[PDB]
Amino acid sequence: ADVPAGVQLADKQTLVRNNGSEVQSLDPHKIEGVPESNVSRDLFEGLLISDVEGHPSPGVAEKWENKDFKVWTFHLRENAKWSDGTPVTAHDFVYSWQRLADPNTASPYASYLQYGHIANIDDIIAGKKPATDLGVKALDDHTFEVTLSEPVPYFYKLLVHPSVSPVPKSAVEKFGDKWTQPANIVTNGAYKLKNWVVNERIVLERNPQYWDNAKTVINQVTYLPISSEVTDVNRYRSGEIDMTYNNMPIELFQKLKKEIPNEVRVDPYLCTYYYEINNQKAPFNDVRVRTALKLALDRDIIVNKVKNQGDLPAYSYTPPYTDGAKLVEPEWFKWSQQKRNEEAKKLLAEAGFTADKPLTFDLLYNTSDLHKKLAIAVASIWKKNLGVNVNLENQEWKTFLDTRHQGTFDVARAGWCADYNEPTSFLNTMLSDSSNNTAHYKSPAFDKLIADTLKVADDTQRSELYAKAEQQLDKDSAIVPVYYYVNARLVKPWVGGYTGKDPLDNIYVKNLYIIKH
């Protein structure tokens, strides 16, 4: 943290953050969500990290070079260490990226290496080549070299993500799935794991072996697993919680803006809220059905009547304010809702649905006040506008993600947040073979458009290709875009260091501090 001249620090430097749900895991190779990544940035540090405004900055690598954007050389700081005092080396990164690529690890983020195009990744994922053929090598203990199959000018931006953080081979090998328990875990971020009580709390304590430990101010941070946004706000206003999770409740928000304006932080956020359709499951494998659901959802009502928290109605998957996004707003989004409803009704009538044999399906969402209220509203809107019946089903976060990967569900509530600020951080998830493709969407035309983006050496042609890829997604009604999120949360007046300037919201507790109050 960089404490401004003149601020008086509190005697006790402890922080309590709500984290939205119980994490799936603390293993960087087994996680995919926001809550997981929140804890992951405090414990495991990769080659680069985000600074307080979100700019990619030195992490374990102090400096780096590239040759033709295809060979990237990272110079690792000599004093980078794990919490047991041992050095973090380039061998740790070789092992870790191999483990991430290895199909036996079954990481949800195995395709992150395809997104960066590390050499030989496709064959490794397919089981055609061993993970040791991955295009990474340690040239020495402090030098990590990555070789890609084609120029990727934004490659370094991907490196702040948890999936490419290092993991300690000896703990993984000796303890297997229990390597992340407090007694066994070894970490290289600013914090160490002190306590992990499932569905109660995660408590982290400062890691004195961290190379930048002298700048760390918070000594202990607790992450809570509260999925009820109302309860989160309640425990924040009671004094227990210092920073809520950034999912806000419909019951109280309007009230909060009026009652505590200075504590309500609302900043840009590169995330899209949408209803994920299982594209491989009839009758959702019919574009007419999917298009009807997309058109009959009334975004004006959701965004301004039922939620009204500053979200913008969405018509795409990639947020239009992503760096590099120049999207074409489709004609259906400018229509009146009445016109969208008649088109939807006509497609559904064309697909075979009648009043006597209506379309009935499930709407899966993870436990949440917000998601429940929004799914009840969406069910009502679809019932009134299109005559479809939906059966709401809630699941806890970890189960919910498992269900979507299992891919036999019908429609699921969904939200994707950028991992790096560039449209492929969204678009690569819809590639036929992506490990993150829970839409189960497979379009050869879409895949080709994205493949073509690194075959041009021009940002203008790349942007035009991303716009066409979004148009192809839209044409196929792969998803139901609802709204672009805003990062809205409460932060006590005494919490310093949270700028809200990073649109990816990659917070590091090592950057925060408690002001005397």
**297 and 264 in one domain?**
no
Indicate the residue among 104, 139, 168 that finishes a domain: 168
Kindly tell me the burial class for residue 356, based on how many C-beta atoms sit within 10 Å of its own C-beta (0-12, 13-18, 19 or more).
exposed
Separation in Å, CA 414 to CA 83, 277, 451, 481: 36, 9, 25, 10
CATH number, domain of 35, equals 3.40.190.10
**260 and 115 in one domain?**
no
**459 and 370 in one domain?**
yes
Position 371, amino acid? H
**178 and 159 in one domain?**
no
Indicate the residue among 133, 168, 203 that finishes a domain: 168
Q: 149 and 455 in contact (C-beta within 8 Å)?
A: no
**246 and 146 in one domain?**
no
Separation of alpha carbons 403 and 416, rounded Å: 16
Q: In terms of Cα–Cα distance, which of 315, 324, 502, 321 is closest to 423?
A: 324
Element (DSSP H or E) covering residue 390: strand 389-395
Position 204, amino acid? L
Angle among Cα 371, 374, 377 to the nearest 5 degrees reads 150
- Both tokens assigned to 67: 């040759």
Place of tokens 């620090």: 9
Indicate the residue among 144, 168, 192 that finishes a domain: 168
470-497 b/e (C-beta count within 10 Å ≥ 16 → b): bbbbbebbbbbbbbbbbbbbbbbeebbb
Count the helix, strand and coil residues of the chain and give each as a percent rounded to the nearest 5.
Answer: 35, 20, 45
Number of domains in the chain: 3
Output the 3-class SS for 157-223. HHCCCHHHCCCCHHHHHHHHHHCCCCCCCCCCCCEEEEEEECCCEEEEEECCCCCCHHHCCCCEEEE
**236 and 106 in one domain?**
no
Separation of alpha carbons 161 and 184, rounded Å: 23
Q: In terms of Cα–Cα distance, which of 152, 146, 164 is closest to 73?
A: 146
Separation of alpha carbons 228 and 367, rounded Å: 7
**54 and 22 in one domain?**
no
**142 and 40 in one domain?**
no
Q: Tell how strand 143-147 and strand 71-76 pair up.
A: antiparallel
- Packing angle, helices 369-386 and 287-296, rounded to 10: 110
Position 400, amino acid? F
CATH number, domain of 89, equals 3.90.76.10
Q: 226 and 18 in contact (C-beta within 8 Å)?
A: yes
Full residue range of the structural domain in which residue 514 is found: 1-44+169-270+487-517
- Both tokens assigned to 358: 């209506």
- Both tokens assigned to 294: 């997309």
**386 and 261 in one domain?**
no
Contacts of 112 (CB under 8 A, 6+ apart): 100, 158, 161, 163, 164, 419
**280 and 246 in one domain?**
no
Beta strands in 91-161 (DSSP E): 136-140, 143-147
The resolution, in angstroms to one decimal, equals 1.8
Separation of alpha carbons 86 and 181, rounded Å: 19
Q: In terms of Cα–Cα distance, which of 308, 303, 508, 326 is closest to 423?
A: 326
Per the entry, the structure determination technique was: X-ray
CATH number, domain of 321, equals 3.10.105.10
Q: Tell how strand 411-417 and strand 264-277 pair up.
A: antiparallel
**CA end-to-end span of the chain, whole Å?**
19
**399 and 420 in one domain?**
yes
**85 and 37 in one domain?**
no
Separation of alpha carbons 72 and 452, rounded Å: 22
